[PDB]
């Protein structure tokens, strides 16, 4: 259990439950049997996390030359990597080539020009819109034609809705659109056999739109537009789905201020594990490592002199005391400063 | 010259060109506009080695806010006396490190901190920081705080405050200083040896600031005369951060990808998850600057710059008129030395 790694043992530290990942996978292979997962390394590049996912037979979605170097470092073969970054730096595209990574994405003619000059025989996937990335459908015909003139081996379509979804229809529409563009590619003599549904899948039960109400809507549309076919290969770039809940952060209360409301200061914040409050819209919940009081409105703060380095605003907590620990669960996604300790629960040695 | 030694090694990873001389000039201007105030450089702003060494040689003091910043400053030969542990709420093991390093001046703004101090660093010269939400004791609670410090046998040596850089009006400095006199007297009244006044930081580092440094030094010197007339027993200091380094750093990024629509979008190999974290953390508004001097009646078009990351939030510029650029061409960003720093850094002196 995690619930007692921590309870077994003042710098902040991470407790990572690898077993929670293995469970996330099983649930994936179940709710989306047709979709092969390519883990968005950017979400959490922890070594054990990558190795664990590797062993589970997963693929990796690298978006930079370093992520590729990292994945290739743990023995993962090039074939299992997708350089899913649309606009890539030439020296990088060059690194991918030299590393055996032949699948990359793109969303504009320009990228194709760079590819033609640097990685000609690269299997290219056309990412479509669902602001910064994704070619509009209307411009796809023109793009493909140009890829034709550039002798680019276009092997599929991809998209990404993101995690800010309230409604799963977005997945249905993006997939319908993918068929449309898929046909054009096939129409222009392009060998279209890959469908990338991206990421944005809930890593917690915390969020209203369940993973499973999503897999459902996806499988439906995936049946109405991409019926089974041995030539076809469907993948996704899940990031937070696999690691959000696997990480639990333990911070130590370093200073207090009373006034009846409290103000606690912990040794980690926005300039660290909590950069996710500013970068990823994260809303966290402080959780005492103490057994359950009169509760009072509180606020937690990072150890930094920056008045913006605030972790919690107004959360009811029991009166805490300097030196006592505070926990934050669901801190594995876009958070990794805290050493990392792993735990493998409910699993057959 | 920068404007040209950049226009030397561009003979495509991003790099910093730091003009140390711009720092030496910043100092002279300080010793001139604020002769009575000794500067303690807020290391947090930019901890570059040459920057610290340069400031050291210029006979400046250092405002460290953590155990590492102290270790760093102590590392370049700077003596403990020239350091002020200006972080109000400090982690005990840290307070312990300061002690062991000879750093005896620290700040505080609540009784609590005093308790920690009494148990860990008794003979520490403590500076009470006042309000100008996260830091700064209100004046109304200062009497009570001092009394408690008395009961704790704390050697309270002064007052401090911080208005920050979000100032439109310098009066704030005048009021904070008036308030500092008031609390200064109480300390003296309770038998406390009050002989230090810390005016904090928040002084312009760029010539783009509405509020001039010099209209500020003026208002400060005025109030400093009406409340803290010269006195050999008195010592006045400040914690300037951005003033000394903002304009000394010039960032060079390489355009790695492009897209058209008449408007343009550019992708560079650095952004919010790096040197540009200042757009999210420090309210920075940057200006892209071609490294290809201009030509004529050039046609300029609305553009946008973007970080190399898959994050749609990794946007550097929104809508800025620039000439049509081309992948492989450089883009410059000036005034990027404050709260921005591994793009390799290059130094011009
Ligand atoms: C909506 N957020 C959910 C929520 O259901 C949450 O449950 C926590 C639960 O974990 C806490 O219980 C905690 O107790 C101990 C800790 C040392 O005190 C640990 O074992 C562990 O953190 C947890 N079991 C409980 N005290 C409050 C609920 N909100 O569990 C995780 C979550 C998915 O983020
Ligand atoms: C917006 N920053 C202001 C600004 O006045 C700036 O001067 C720039 C000047 O640096 C630029 O001129 C630039 O010229 C070349 C580049 C090839 O064009 C660069 O190599 C060089 O660093 C720079 N001097 C000029 N194009 C506009 C002015 N506003 O100087 C710094 C500053 C005062 O903070
Ligand atoms: C090509 C691509 N593939 C997978 C994922 C993974 O998303 P998720 O982890 O939700 O499944 C992302 C998410 N990148 C940032 C995330 C913002 C981070 N601060 C976003 O703005 O969605 C992406 O751009
Ligand atoms: C006690 C203390 N003394 C000096 C400085 C230096 O400020 P400046 O460099 O402007 O002079 C700081 C910087 N704190 C954040 C900075 C926010 C960083 N994004 C702020 O709100 O200005 C501080 O907390």
PDB file of N, CA, C and O in Angstrom, chain B residues 163-185:
ATOM      1  N   UNK B 163       7.471  46.458  -1.772  1.00  0.00           N
ATOM      2  CA  UNK B 163       6.294  46.873  -2.523  1.00  0.00           C
ATOM      3  C   UNK B 163       6.115  46.042  -3.784  1.00  0.00           C
ATOM      4  O   UNK B 163       4.995  45.851  -4.257  1.00  0.00           O
ATOM      5  N   UNK B 164       7.219  45.545  -4.328  1.00  0.00           N
ATOM      6  CA  UNK B 164       7.130  44.754  -5.540  1.00  0.00           C
ATOM      7  C   UNK B 164       7.293  45.617  -6.774  1.00  0.00           C
ATOM      8  O   UNK B 164       7.463  46.834  -6.672  1.00  0.00           O
ATOM      9  N   UNK B 165       7.223  44.995  -7.945  1.00  0.00           N
ATOM     10  CA  UNK B 165       7.389  45.712  -9.205  1.00  0.00           C
ATOM     11  C   UNK B 165       6.091  46.190  -9.859  1.00  0.00           C
ATOM     12  O   UNK B 165       6.124  46.905 -10.862  1.00  0.00           O
ATOM     13  N   UNK B 166       4.953  45.808  -9.290  1.00  0.00           N
ATOM     14  CA  UNK B 166       3.681  46.222  -9.859  1.00  0.00           C
ATOM     15  C   UNK B 166       3.255  47.608  -9.414  1.00  0.00           C
ATOM     16  O   UNK B 166       2.078  47.841  -9.132  1.00  0.00           O
ATOM     17  N   UNK B 167       4.209  48.533  -9.355  1.00  0.00           N
ATOM     18  CA  UNK B 167       3.914  49.895  -8.926  1.00  0.00           C
ATOM     19  C   UNK B 167       3.777  50.888 -10.067  1.00  0.00           C
ATOM     20  O   UNK B 167       4.607  50.944 -10.973  1.00  0.00           O
ATOM     21  N   UNK B 168       2.709  51.670 -10.000  1.00  0.00           N
ATOM     22  CA  UNK B 168       2.423  52.703 -10.983  1.00  0.00           C
ATOM     23  C   UNK B 168       2.819  54.017 -10.340  1.00  0.00           C
ATOM     24  O   UNK B 168       3.229  54.973 -11.006  1.00  0.00           O
ATOM     25  N   UNK B 169       2.695  54.025  -9.019  1.00  0.00           N
ATOM     26  CA  UNK B 169       2.951  55.192  -8.205  1.00  0.00           C
ATOM     27  C   UNK B 169       3.974  54.895  -7.084  1.00  0.00           C
ATOM     28  O   UNK B 169       3.871  53.889  -6.377  1.00  0.00           O
ATOM     29  N   UNK B 170       4.979  55.764  -6.965  1.00  0.00           N
ATOM     30  CA  UNK B 170       6.055  55.599  -5.983  1.00  0.00           C
ATOM     31  C   UNK B 170       5.688  55.954  -4.545  1.00  0.00           C
ATOM     32  O   UNK B 170       6.453  55.673  -3.620  1.00  0.00           O
ATOM     33  N   UNK B 171       4.525  56.566  -4.357  1.00  0.00           N
ATOM     34  CA  UNK B 171       4.074  56.954  -3.024  1.00  0.00           C
ATOM     35  C   UNK B 171       4.191  55.760  -2.085  1.00  0.00           C
ATOM     36  O   UNK B 171       4.549  55.901  -0.911  1.00  0.00           O
ATOM     37  N   UNK B 172       3.878  54.587  -2.622  1.00  0.00           N
ATOM     38  CA  UNK B 172       3.927  53.343  -1.868  1.00  0.00           C
ATOM     39  C   UNK B 172       5.229  53.224  -1.089  1.00  0.00           C
ATOM     40  O   UNK B 172       5.243  52.750   0.047  1.00  0.00           O
ATOM     41  N   UNK B 173       6.323  53.652  -1.710  1.00  0.00           N
ATOM     42  CA  UNK B 173       7.629  53.615  -1.067  1.00  0.00           C
ATOM     43  C   UNK B 173       7.669  54.604   0.093  1.00  0.00           C
ATOM     44  O   UNK B 173       8.236  54.322   1.147  1.00  0.00           O
ATOM     45  N   UNK B 174       7.059  55.767  -0.117  1.00  0.00           N
ATOM     46  CA  UNK B 174       7.017  56.811   0.895  1.00  0.00           C
ATOM     47  C   UNK B 174       6.246  56.343   2.128  1.00  0.00           C
ATOM     48  O   UNK B 174       6.697  56.533   3.260  1.00  0.00           O
ATOM     49  N   UNK B 175       5.090  55.725   1.900  1.00  0.00           N
ATOM     50  CA  UNK B 175       4.248  55.236   2.984  1.00  0.00           C
ATOM     51  C   UNK B 175       4.877  54.075   3.743  1.00  0.00           C
ATOM     52  O   UNK B 175       4.779  53.993   4.964  1.00  0.00           O
ATOM     53  N   UNK B 176       5.519  53.173   3.013  1.00  0.00           N
ATOM     54  CA  UNK B 176       6.159  52.020   3.631  1.00  0.00           C
ATOM     55  C   UNK B 176       7.302  52.476   4.527  1.00  0.00           C
ATOM     56  O   UNK B 176       7.572  51.875   5.570  1.00  0.00           O
ATOM     57  N   UNK B 177       7.971  53.548   4.117  1.00  0.00           N
ATOM     58  CA  UNK B 177       9.085  54.084   4.885  1.00  0.00           C
ATOM     59  C   UNK B 177       8.601  54.834   6.122  1.00  0.00           C
ATOM     60  O   UNK B 177       9.242  54.788   7.173  1.00  0.00           O
ATOM     61  N   UNK B 178       7.474  55.525   5.996  1.00  0.00           N
ATOM     62  CA  UNK B 178       6.903  56.238   7.127  1.00  0.00           C
ATOM     63  C   UNK B 178       6.559  55.170   8.160  1.00  0.00           C
ATOM     64  O   UNK B 178       6.941  55.266   9.331  1.00  0.00           O
ATOM     65  N   UNK B 179       5.846  54.142   7.703  1.00  0.00           N
ATOM     66  CA  UNK B 179       5.442  53.029   8.552  1.00  0.00           C
ATOM     67  C   UNK B 179       6.647  52.380   9.213  1.00  0.00           C
ATOM     68  O   UNK B 179       6.584  51.978  10.372  1.00  0.00           O
ATOM     69  N   UNK B 180       7.746  52.276   8.476  1.00  0.00           N
ATOM     70  CA  UNK B 180       8.949  51.663   9.016  1.00  0.00           C
ATOM     71  C   UNK B 180       9.511  52.447  10.192  1.00  0.00           C
ATOM     72  O   UNK B 180      10.100  51.862  11.098  1.00  0.00           O
ATOM     73  N   UNK B 181       9.341  53.769  10.173  1.00  0.00           N
ATOM     74  CA  UNK B 181       9.824  54.620  11.264  1.00  0.00           C
ATOM     75  C   UNK B 181       9.026  54.256  12.509  1.00  0.00           C
ATOM     76  O   UNK B 181       9.585  53.965  13.566  1.00  0.00           O
ATOM     77  N   UNK B 182       7.706  54.276  12.352  1.00  0.00           N
ATOM     78  CA  UNK B 182       6.773  53.949  13.415  1.00  0.00           C
ATOM     79  C   UNK B 182       7.165  52.661  14.131  1.00  0.00           C
ATOM     80  O   UNK B 182       7.349  52.654  15.348  1.00  0.00           O
ATOM     81  N   UNK B 183       7.290  51.573  13.375  1.00  0.00           N
ATOM     82  CA  UNK B 183       7.661  50.285  13.952  1.00  0.00           C
ATOM     83  C   UNK B 183       9.093  50.334  14.466  1.00  0.00           C
ATOM     84  O   UNK B 183       9.440  49.657  15.432  1.00  0.00           O
ATOM     85  N   UNK B 184       9.924  51.140  13.815  1.00  0.00           N
ATOM     86  CA  UNK B 184      11.323  51.287  14.214  1.00  0.00           C
ATOM     87  C   UNK B 184      11.373  51.829  15.642  1.00  0.00           C
ATOM     88  O   UNK B 184      12.174  51.383  16.464  1.00  0.00           O
ATOM     89  N   UNK B 185      10.505  52.797  15.925  1.00  0.00           N
ATOM     90  CA  UNK B 185      10.449  53.408  17.245  1.00  0.00           C
ATOM     91  C   UNK B 185      10.000  52.417  18.306  1.00  0.00           C
ATOM     92  O   UNK B 185      10.611  52.330  19.372  1.00  0.00           O
TER      93      UNK B 185
END
